[model samples]
Target: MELWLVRHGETLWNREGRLLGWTDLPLTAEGEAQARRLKGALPSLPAFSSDLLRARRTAELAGFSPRLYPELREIHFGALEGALWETLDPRYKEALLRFQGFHPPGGESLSAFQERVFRFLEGLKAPAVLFTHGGVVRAVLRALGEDGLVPPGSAVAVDWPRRVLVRLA
Candidate 1:
């Protein structure tokens, strides 16, 4: 089976470069437009989304009534949730970039986050489209052994368990 992983459209927080984890912000008008265009852009398949408004709204605008999954949420940023990335401590930024044992105060650990994501992936029964967040996409890509950032409103297809087949920019 294949997973068509999609990141949600841009939010005001996204534009401001804030750590937008676990915060339920709605999509911007540009984001909605980007989603509207995804109807024809995405493959017709079973769809799923993070329960967050942005992901759910993306799925709706993209013409998919997706199953909601909390497991698909971006890693919780905890106390650092709304902090601007550029202004964050260099050590915190380094920890994030390194994907080491870095957990923000009150946030989920990287290992735990990956475990939950993989657990969700393990339960898949067929090819599907997943509407989620940037961090979720990154986790999926990492699980598939690929390295890259998936821009908002973009999608990627990967063969179950490991191989990346294509990217939809």
Candidate 2:
């Protein structure tokens, strides 16, 4: 029942400090290189993604062929796709500050993301590797009893993914 959850490598938007909520962006060169290194470091396992190219490629680079799953995507940011935190319209920012667990102006809410991931996990077998966004990873972690799994930057770790096995036990 072990799970290996990975955050896709950096993207141009990520480097630019913009919100990538639902906007599909390509991985940068360094991101690709990181994926290569991560690939060599991973324990070979069945892989899956949220039908996003960045995540799928990261898994492939990490030596796992990713199965696309529309359910495991990041929380939708609505109109905030490429907007910087500072540039967000005041109304949206205020709403964001009040952002709860579902629905963002034009996207799925935190609760919705969780529902999808939960359903996705319900249908999966053990020893799986999920190449997904940070939001998806956070939702998975929360479901695993880790409520605060936010990684400040693009850093990676091997914790909660390993913790999933314990959860299923």
Candidate 3:
């Protein structure tokens, strides 16, 4: 099945350059505007979103009332919830940058996180729109052999478990 994955709009945390994971933050005004612009960009398809406020709000503003799924949440940063990337401990930074086998204190492991995300993807039986987070988008793209980030309010189309079809920025 095809998947249209979009990152949630900018939040105050986003503007402040803090790590946002499993935190329930609202969208900024510009974020809301970004969401509104997404309305015309998305295809008319079934939709899903992380239960977090940012993702949910983005979906609603983008004209999609999506099914909420905790499994769609961003990776739990745990003890490092809101730390600035530049200030993070060198070990943690290196682990994240390497993108392999790193687990944050009180947070989910990369392997486990990918398992849940991949499980969710495997369960999809039809094409759908997903209002999610940056990390989730990266995970999805990485699984398909692409490594990159999608800007907030942007979407990518892919044939699941296959290649990236198009970027709907």
Candidate 4:
């Protein structure tokens, strides 16, 4: 199987360096513009998206009306949602920076988050485009052995359960 993971465009929290989980923020005007740019860049394929507003809007802007899936949402930040990165607890910060050993207060653990994401991926029937969040994209990329950092509104393609194919920024 093949998968194309698109990270939705930015919200104000993205610029402010805050943790974004299930907060349901909309994209900035610039973020919308960023999404439109992807309309011509992606392949035409079966599409699916996170149920979040940001990811949903990005999918629409990118010329796709994708099926929505909560499994594709970002990690549930819970008590940490919208918490400033600069003021975050050191342990949380380190865990986040390292992309492991992270469990935000009252939120999903990293392991659990990854499990949800991977399980959704495992159910895909074929090559498809997934409009999702940063964490979901990161989890998929990291599982395939990359550093997993991508700019907002960008996308990465992979030969699923195997290697990366390309990155469209």
- Put down candidate 1 lDDT per residue, 73-137, tens digits, no spaces: 99999999999898999988998887777788798988888889889988999899999888878
Clashing pairs in 2: 39-62, 101-111, 103-109
Q: Which candidate number has the best TM-score?
A: 4
Quantify how close model 3 is to the true structure by its C-alpha RMSD in Å. 0.9
lDDT score of model 4? 0.93
Candidate 2 lDDT, 73-137, residue by residue in tens: 77778866787978776766675444443455677766676777778777876767777887776
By TM-score, the better pick of 1 and 2 is: 1
Best by lDDT: 4
Q: Write the residue-wise lDDT of candidate 3 on 1-169 in tens digits.
A: 7999999889998888788998788999999999999997899899999999999999999999899999999999999899898899989889887677779899999898888988999889999999999988998888788975888988999998889999988
Clashes of each: 0, 3, 0, 0
Total clashes in model 3, counting residue pairs 3 or more apart in sequence or in different chains: 0
RMSD of each: 1.0, 4.4, 0.9, 0.7
For candidate 4, lDDT tens digit of each residue in 71-149? 9999999999999999899999999888999999999999999999999988999899999999988888888898799
Which 10-residue window of candidate 1 scores lowest in summed lDDT? 139-148
Off by over 4 Å in 1: none
The whole-model lDDT of each prediction reads: 0.89, 0.68, 0.90, 0.93
Residue pairs with backbone overlap in model 3 = none
